[PDB]
């Protein structure tokens, strides 16, 4: 019973690490997205801020 | 540092100066009796040492089980009596448990078990209490040695650690070995030794266990009292130096408020 | 608002149980916490253009209204999608290992199901037999049992 | 402030005042009773806060003519690194006469190397 | 009143008994349980600077301290436990805290929902 | 400066009048004793009450 349930609960542990990998790389790519937009949003004010 | 705050602090240390100077006079009498009783029981532990001079017995190679016994009182305010025994005990179970033998300690008195319950909480056979509040005796050593047999633990090598009283200022923590299995107790020096059987050597070594706890109930009680005298003189000298430095601060602070309130009046009249 | 959800995966995800690879998951959830709320404040949209606001009240044009006209007429440089190889190649090798290990334990369940049913074969009664009890308890050749 | 002086520096700052206050708050009991009536955790905010007091004294450049000792200048990043190795407890075997009147932290282990 | 009524007395019980700094005897069933409830509630009371909380974000974090749900941590991790807890409830449990601010009280069914959230988070806090 | 009525003296029970680190070391020491006698006594109450009825 245990050697059956050792492989049973293992494959539910194998699929947990692929849910965690699929959202981590999807989010860590996404955190650089608006941060690329933020710096251009930053720079377009600073050239306006210098003139005013 | 106002006038009220200096007074209430100075009044406190004048109390603590009396209490510790009375407490030295209490413990000067307890040591003066506990100096007297030890020299009768000095010749009692002469006999059990004289057994091992003519028959030189040692712990030969290795044991399966072990004991460590450490005596103390339950009372504090004695300086370096209890930590001169617990730190000796942790200096041997680290030295042991690598040759493979199983160790189990017993601490008579509360203050050993207080130190060694956060790291060595598992090797405890039994614990005792209520040691040294009344003077220790021989019937007290026959309750330690009797409950040590109603335990099931077969022990084949042990030792006891106590403070050998040297002088009023100085004590020395020593150790003494205990041979408890009949195997190590019947060796080459015991070849000349007559009529005692294995069943009589069962009887003789057990009276030595009540004996060798009694020799260490008369050493660690004198040294616990004569370090309760010397460490109370140094709480009384260290209080005389704290009030004489606080009388002077009080005297200047008393004079500086007479002057302060008086200039408030001199300037209150002349401003009219 | 390009944002993805997930499942509740915090309890046994540190219990991945590699070959003593505890740091593989204990660093994995540690990256997972900080990346979550930080990329949420990235994912939706950028704020209102405050470049067009104060350049209109500013009179010195030429390099003011034209710079906001030129630099705000292009596309957003998005990121590259380099994470695809370990998505498929790491996944199926654990699912292919699920096929053999669920059957190699099944024969170990099947042989253990046969090992007990043969133990019920040996005795039909307390006074049953002198040879049916000679399967579990052993016999041997000459001079085996010393004592 | 953790945002200005840097959040690593700000935690060696507030964490070394905490160990210094706790040495002050027992000076009533140590002066009367003794060191020997303390616990084992509070013989380890006493011995660690006497290694920290001594490691705040530095030989100055203008004071070479008084005592004949070389004036030492330490940088910023070698003091934060040198106090985290007294708070974490790496130097708890070196005595306290080695942390005294030295510059950067490597002179403290060198002064401890001299006396043996 | 529910969570800081009991907090006021549990801290007052602490301060009478927690000023030795020199221990000789051991009473873990007797004293050391109560003083372990104070250091979990003392280190909860610390705060930062120019970041003030709300009242229902206060009821949640104070709930988890007095109801025994922190005695298996370490006290050097409760300041770390707080911000990970607080970010989880504002993000995933926004309709929970809106029933404390609107209804005023912490109701018995509202006592029910919070009983899992602290224990579900404690099941996967340190991993 | 104590062997004179002009020189100041102390009262009885002034250690806990200051509020130092001996007045705290004593206010807490009394609660660490009289909290554990409060459940030697508490446990025995059920039996004592019964005993009163018995005799």
DSSP assignment, residue E75?
G
| Chain E residues 5-34 with CB within 8 Å of chain D | 21-23
Q: What is the DSSP string of B57-73?
A: ----S--S--EEEEE--
Radius of gyration from C-alpha coordinates of chain E: 16
Phi, psi of B45 (to 5 degrees): -85, 0
Give the Cα separation of B165 and A35 in Å (integer): 76
Give the Cα separation of D115 and C66 in Å (integer): 75
Query: How many angstroms separate the Cα of B79 from the Cα of each of B21, B71, C26, D111?
Result: 17, 16, 47, 32
Q: Name which of B49, B210, B221 is nearest B142 in CA terms.
A: B210
Please give the span between the terminal C-alpha atoms of chain E, in angstroms, as a whole number.
Answer: 34
- For residues B246 and B10, is the Cβ–Cβ distance under 8 A? yes
Q: Name which of B254, D37, D19, B15 is nearest F20 in CA terms.
A: B15
Give the Cα separation of D57 and D78 in Å (integer): 15
- For residues B28 and B229, is the Cβ–Cβ distance under 8 A? yes
- For residues D55 and D83, is the Cβ–Cβ distance under 8 A? yes
Give the Cα separation of B40 and B140 in Å (integer): 17
Burial pattern B197-235, b for ≥16 Cβ within 10 A else e, equals eeeebeeeeeebbbbbbbbbbbbbbbbbbbbbbbbbeeb
Size of interface E-F (CB pairs under 8 A): 24
Rounded to the nearest angstrom, the minimum Cα separation between B14 and chain F is 7
Give the Cα separation of D17 and D4 in Å (integer): 19
Query: How many angstroms separate the Cα of F49 from the Cα of each of F35, F38, F42, F43, F55?
Result: 22, 17, 11, 11, 10
Q: Name which of E82, C79, C24 is nearest A20 in CA terms.
A: C24
Rounded to the nearest angstrom, the minimum Cα separation between C137 and chain A is 25
Give the Cα separation of E70 and E44 in Å (integer): 10
Give the Cα separation of B201 and B188 in Å (integer): 15
- For residues B161 and B89, is the Cβ–Cβ distance under 8 A? yes
Q: Name which of B189, B161, B186 is nearest B52 in CA terms.
A: B189
Q: How far is CA B202 from the centre of its chain?
A: 31
Residue matched to tokens 């190649």 = C89
Query: How many angstroms separate the Cα of D78 from the Cα of each of C78, D13, D110?
Result: 41, 14, 16
- For residues A18 and C91, is the Cβ–Cβ distance under 8 A? yes
- Judged by DSSP in three states, B178 sits in strand
**Hey, what are A15's tokens?**
């699929």
**Hey, what are B20's tokens?**
């510790």
Spatial strand order of the sheet with B124-127 comes to: B124-127, B104-108, B67-71, B157-165, B171-179
Give the Cα separation of D91 and D113 in Å (integer): 13
Q: What angle do CA F40, F45, F50 make, to 5 degrees?
A: 145
Query: How many angstroms separate the Cα of F43 from the Cα of each of D41, E26, E31?
Result: 35, 21, 17
Alpha helices in chain B (DSSP H): 3-34, 38-42, 44-54, 83-93, 110-115, 141-147, 182-185, 198-214, 222-269
Q: What size, in residues, is chain D?
A: 116
Scanning every residue of chain F, which has its alpha carbon at the shortest distance from the alpha carbon of E32? F32
List gaps in chain E by the residue before each (C–N > 2.5 Å).
none
Residues B199 and B69 in one domain: yes
Residues B149, B152, B155, B160: what is their CA dihedral angle, to the nearest 10 degrees? -50
Scanning every residue of chain F, which has its alpha carbon at the shortest distance from the alpha carbon of E23? F29
Q: Name which of B144, B230, B184 is nearest B55 in CA terms.
A: B184
Q: Helices E56-66 and E108-123: crossing angle, nearest 10°?
A: 70
Phi, psi of B180 (to 5 degrees): -125, -25
Q: What's the resolution in A?
A: 3.3
Give the Cα separation of E109 and E115 in Å (integer): 10
- For residues D49 and D102, is the Cβ–Cβ distance under 8 A? no
Contact list, E124 vs chain C (CB under 8 Å): 10-11, 13-14
Query: How many angstroms separate the Cα of C19 from the Cα of each of B225, C25, E54, E126?
Result: 59, 12, 46, 21
**Hey, what are C4's tokens?**
């993805």
Residue matched to tokens 């030429």 = C62
Going by the annotation, the residues of the binding site of E for ATP are 47, 49
Give the Cα separation of A38 and C41 in Å (integer): 11
Size of interface D-E (CB pairs under 8 A): 11
Give the Cα separation of D76 and E114 in Å (integer): 47
Rounded to the nearest angstrom, the minimum Cα separation between D34 and chain B is 8
Q: What size, in residues, is chain A?
A: 52
Our count of domains for chain B comes to: 2
Tell me which method was used to determine the 3D structure.
cryo-EM
Give the Cα separation of E26 and F55 in Å (integer): 39
- For residues E61 and E85, is the Cβ–Cβ distance under 8 A? yes
Q: Name which of B143, B139, B151, B73 is nearest B112 in CA terms.
A: B73
- For residues E71 and E28, is the Cβ–Cβ distance under 8 A? no
- For residues D29 and F21, is the Cβ–Cβ distance under 8 A? yes
Q: Helices E94-103 and E78-92: crossing angle, nearest 10°?
A: 90
Determine, for residues B110 and E23 on separate chains, whether the beta-carbon distance falls below 8 Å. no
- Judged by DSSP in three states, B53 sits in helix
Give the Cα separation of B46 and B215 in Å (integer): 10
**Hey, what are C115's tokens?**
């090992």
Q: Name which of C56, C52, C74, C46 is nearest A39 in CA terms.
A: C46
Give the Cα separation of B160 and B190 in Å (integer): 24
Scanning every residue of chain F, which has its alpha carbon at the shortest distance from the alpha carbon of E22? F25
Contact list, D26 vs chain E (CB under 8 Å): 21
Provide CB contacts within 8 A for D102, sequence distance 6+: D55, D72, D108, D111
Give the Cα separation of B265 and B72 in Å (integer): 66
- Beta strands in F1-55, from DSSP E residues, in sequence order: none
Query: Would you tell me how many other CB atoms lie within 10 Å of the CB of residue D102?
Result: 21
CATH number at residue E74: 1.20.150.20
Query: Hey, what long-range contacts does C60-64 have (CB within 8 A, 24 or more apart)?
Result: C60/A51, C64/A48, C64/A51
Provide CB contacts within 8 A for E4, sequence distance 6+: E62
Q: Name which of B178, B176, B180 is nearest B219 in CA terms.
A: B176
Q: Helices B198-214 and B44-54: crossing angle, nearest 10°?
A: 130
- For residues B243 and F10, is the Cβ–Cβ distance under 8 A? no
Q: What size, in residues, is chain F?
A: 55
Burial of D20 (0-12, 13-18, 19+ CB in 10 A): middle
Q: Name which of B39, B81, B52 is nearest B215 in CA terms.
A: B39
Contact list, C37 vs chain E (CB under 8 Å): 87, 91
Determine, for residues B111 and E24 on separate chains, whether the beta-carbon distance falls below 8 Å. yes
CATH number at residue B248: 1.10.287.80
Determine, for residues D29 and F20 on separate chains, whether the beta-carbon distance falls below 8 Å. no
Give the Cα separation of D92 and D51 in Å (integer): 9
Q: Helices B3-34 and B222-269: crossing angle, nearest 10°?
A: 160
Radius of gyration from C-alpha coordinates of chain B: 28
Residues B85 and B187 in one domain: yes
Give the Cα separation of E127 and C28 in Å (integer): 10
The CATH code that applies to domain D1-116 is 1.10.1140.10
Query: Hey, what long-range contacts does E101-110 have (CB within 8 A, 24 or more apart)?
Result: E101/E54, E101/E55, E101/E56, E105/E2, E106/E2, E106/E3, E106/E59, E106/E63
Give the Cα separation of B81 and B252 in Å (integer): 43
Give the Cα separation of E111 and B70 in Å (integer): 53
- Judged by DSSP in three states, D6 sits in coil
Residues F11, F16, F22, F28: what is their CA dihedral angle, to the nearest 10 degrees? 150
**Hey, what are A47's tokens?**
């050239």
> Which residues in D have their CB inside 8 Å of a CB on B?
31-34, 36-37, 40
Domain containing B197 equals: 26-231
Determine, for residues A24 and C42 on separate chains, whether the beta-carbon distance falls below 8 Å. no
Helix (H) or strand (E) holding D2: none
- For residues D83 and D16, is the Cβ–Cβ distance under 8 A? yes
Phi, psi of A9 (to 5 degrees): -80, -10
Q: How far is CA C97 from the centre of its chain?
A: 14
- For residues B89 and B68, is the Cβ–Cβ distance under 8 A? yes
Domain containing E19 equals: 1-127
Strand partners, B164: B172
Give the Cα separation of E111 and B3 in Å (integer): 55
- For residues B177 and B47, is the Cβ–Cβ distance under 8 A? no
Q: How far is CA B44 from the centre of its chain?
A: 21
Strand partners, B172: B164
Provide CB contacts within 8 A for F13, sequence distance 6+: none
Provide CB contacts within 8 A for D20, sequence distance 6+: D49, D52, D53
- For residues B157 and B68, is the Cβ–Cβ distance under 8 A? no
Phi, psi of B17 (to 5 degrees): -75, -35
Provide CB contacts within 8 A for C35, sequence distance 6+: A24, A27, A28, A31
Give the Cα separation of E89 and E31 in Å (integer): 34
- For residues B209 and B142, is the Cβ–Cβ distance under 8 A? no
Our count of domains for chain E comes to: 1
Query: Would you tell me how many other CB atoms lie within 10 Å of the CB of residue B245?
Result: 11
Q: What is the DSSP string of chain C?
A: ---------SSSGGG---SS-HHHHHTHHHHHHHHHHHHHTTTS------HHHHHHH----SSSTTHHHHTTSS----------HHHHHTTHHHHHHHHHHHHHHHHHHHHHHHHHHTHHHH-SSTT--SSGGGTTS---SSS----
Q: What size, in residues, is chain B?
A: 272
Query: How many angstroms separate the Cα of E12 from the Cα of each of D31, E107, F10?
Result: 30, 26, 32
Phi, psi of D45 (to 5 degrees): -105, 0
Provide CB contacts within 8 A for C87, sequence distance 6+: A21, A22
Rounded to the nearest angstrom, the minimum Cα separation between E70 and chain D is 23
For chain D, which residues make up each domain, given as ranges?
A: 1-116
Give the Cα separation of C49 and D58 in Å (integer): 55
- For residues D29 and F25, is the Cβ–Cβ distance under 8 A? yes
Radius of gyration from C-alpha coordinates of chain D: 16
- For residues C133 and C123, is the Cβ–Cβ distance under 8 A? yes
Domain containing F37 equals: 1-55
Give the Cα separation of B211 and B48 in Å (integer): 8
Give the Cα separation of B173 and B90 in Å (integer): 14
Give the Cα separation of B205 and B145 in Å (integer): 11
Q: How far is CA F21 from the centre of its chain?
A: 17
Determine, for residues F22 and D25 on separate chains, whether the beta-carbon distance falls below 8 Å. no
DSSP assignment, residue B107?
E
- For residues B175 and B88, is the Cβ–Cβ distance under 8 A? yes
Query: Hey, what long-range contacts does E115-120 have (CB within 8 A, 24 or more apart)?
Result: E117/E89, E117/E93, E118/E63, E118/E64, E118/E67, E118/E69, E119/E69, E120/C8
Scanning every residue of chain B, which has its alpha carbon at the shortest distance from the alpha carbon of E26? B114
**Hey, what are D92's tokens?**
């708890």
Our count of domains for chain F comes to: 1
Q: Name which of A24, D97, B21, E127 is nearest C38 in CA terms.
A: A24
Q: Name which of D104, D80, D81, D82 is nearest D5 in CA terms.
A: D80
Give the Cα separation of D57 and E94 in Å (integer): 54
CATH number at residue B197: 3.40.1380.10
């Amino acid at each position: 019973i245990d050697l059956e349930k050792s492989q049973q609960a293992l494959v539910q542990k194998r699929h947990y690490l692929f849910d965690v990998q699929r959202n981590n790389i999807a989010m860590a790519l996404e955190v650089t997205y608006r941060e690329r937009l933020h710096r251009v949003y930053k720079e377009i004010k600073n050239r306006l801020d210098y003139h005013i | 540092a106002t006038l009220k705050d200096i007074t209430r602090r100075l009044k406190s240390i004048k109390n603590i100066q009396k209490i510790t100077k009375s407490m030295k006079m209490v413990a000067a009498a307890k040591y003066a009796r506990a100096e007297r009783d030890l020299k009768p029981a000095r010749v009692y532990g002469i006999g059990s040492l004289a057994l091992y001079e003519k028959a030189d017995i040692k712990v030969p190679e290795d044991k399966k089980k072990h004991l460590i016994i450490g005596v103390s009182s339950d009372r504090g305010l004695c300086g370096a009596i209890h930590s001169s025994v617990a730190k000796q005990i942790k200096s041997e179970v680290a030295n042991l448990t690598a040759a493979g033998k199983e160790v189990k300690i017993v601490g008579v008195g509360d203050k050993i078990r207080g130190i060694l319950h956060r790291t060595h909480s598992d090797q405890f056979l039994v614990t005792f209490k209520e040691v040294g509040r009344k003077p220790p005796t021989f019937g007290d050593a026959s309750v330690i040695a009797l409950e040590l047999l109603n335990s099931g633990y077969e022990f084949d090598e042990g030792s006891i650690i106590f403070n050998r009283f040297r002088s009023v200022i100085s004590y020395k923590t020593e150790e003494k070995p205990i041979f408890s299995l009949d195997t190590v107790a019947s060796a080459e020096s015991m070849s000349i030794y007559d009529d005692i059987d294995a069943d009589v050597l069962r009887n003789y070594q057990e009276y030595s266990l009540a004996n060798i706890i009694y020799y260490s109930l008369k050493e660690s009680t004198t040294s616990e009292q004569s370090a309760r005298m010397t460490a109370m003189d140094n709480a009384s000298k260290n209080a005389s130096e704290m009030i004489d430095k606080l009388t002077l601060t009080f005297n200047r602070t008393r004079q500086a408020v007479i002057t302060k309130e008086l200039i408030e009046i001199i300037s209150g009249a002349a401003a009219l | 608002r390009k944002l993805a959800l997930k499942a509740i995966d915090w309890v046994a995800f540190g219990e991945i149980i590699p070959r003593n690879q505890k740091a593989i998951a204990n660093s994995l959830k540690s990256w997972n916490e900080t990346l979550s709320t930080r990329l949420a404040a990235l994912p939706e949209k950028p704020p209102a253009i405050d470049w067009a606001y104060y350049k209109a009240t500013v009179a010195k044009a030429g390099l003011v209204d034209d710079f906001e006209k030129k630099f705000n007429a292009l596309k957003v440089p998005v990121p590259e999608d380099k994470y695809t190889a370990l998505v498929d190649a790491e996944e199926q090798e654990d699912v292919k290992r699920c096929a053999e290990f669920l059957s190699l334990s099944k024969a170990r369940i099947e042989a253990y199901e046969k090992e007990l049913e043969k133990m019920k074969n040996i005795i039909p009664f307390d006074q049953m037999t002198i040879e049916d009890l000679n399967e579990v308890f052993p016999e041997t050749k000459l001079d085996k049992k010393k004592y | 402030d953790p945002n200005i002086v840097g959040s690593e520096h700000y935690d060696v700052a507030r964490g070394v005042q905490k160990i210094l206050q706790d040495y002050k708050s027992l000076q009533d009991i140590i002066a009367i009773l003794g060191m020997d009536e303390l616990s084992e955790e509070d013989k380890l905010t006493v011995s660690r806060a006497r290694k920290i007091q001594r490691f705040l004294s530095q030989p100055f450049q203008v004071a070479e003519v008084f005592t004949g000792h070389l004036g030492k200048l330490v940088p910023l990043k070698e003091t934060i690194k040198g106090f985290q190795q007294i708070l974490a407890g790496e130097y708890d075997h070196l005595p306290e006469q080695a942390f005294y009147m030295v510059g950067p932290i490597e002179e403290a282990v060198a002064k401890a190397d001299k006396l043996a | 009143k529910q969570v800081a009524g009991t907090m006021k007395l549990e801290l007052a019980q602490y301060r009478e008994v927690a000023a030795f700094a020199q221990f000789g005897s051991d009473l873990d069933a007797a004293t050391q349980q109560l003083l372990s409830r104070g250091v979990r509630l003392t280190e909860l009371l610390k705060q930062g600077q120019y970041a003030p909380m709300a009242i229902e974000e206060q009821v949640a974090v104070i709930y988890a301290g007095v109801r025994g749900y922190l005695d298996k941590l370490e006290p050097s991790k409760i300041t770390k436990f707080e911000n990970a807890f607080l970010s989880h409830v504002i993000s995933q449990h926004q309709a929970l805290l809106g029933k404390i601010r609107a209804d005023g009280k912490i109701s018995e069914e509202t006592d029910a929902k919070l009983k899992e959230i602290v224990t579900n988070f404690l099941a996967g806090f340190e991993a | 400066s104590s062997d004179t009525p002009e020189g100041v003296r102390s009262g009885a029970g002034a250690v806990r009048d200051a509020g130092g680190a001996f007045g705290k070391k004593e206010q807490a020491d009394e609660e660490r004793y009289f909290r554990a006698r409060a459940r030697e006594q508490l446990a025995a109450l059920k039996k004592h009450h019964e005993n009163e009825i018995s005799h």
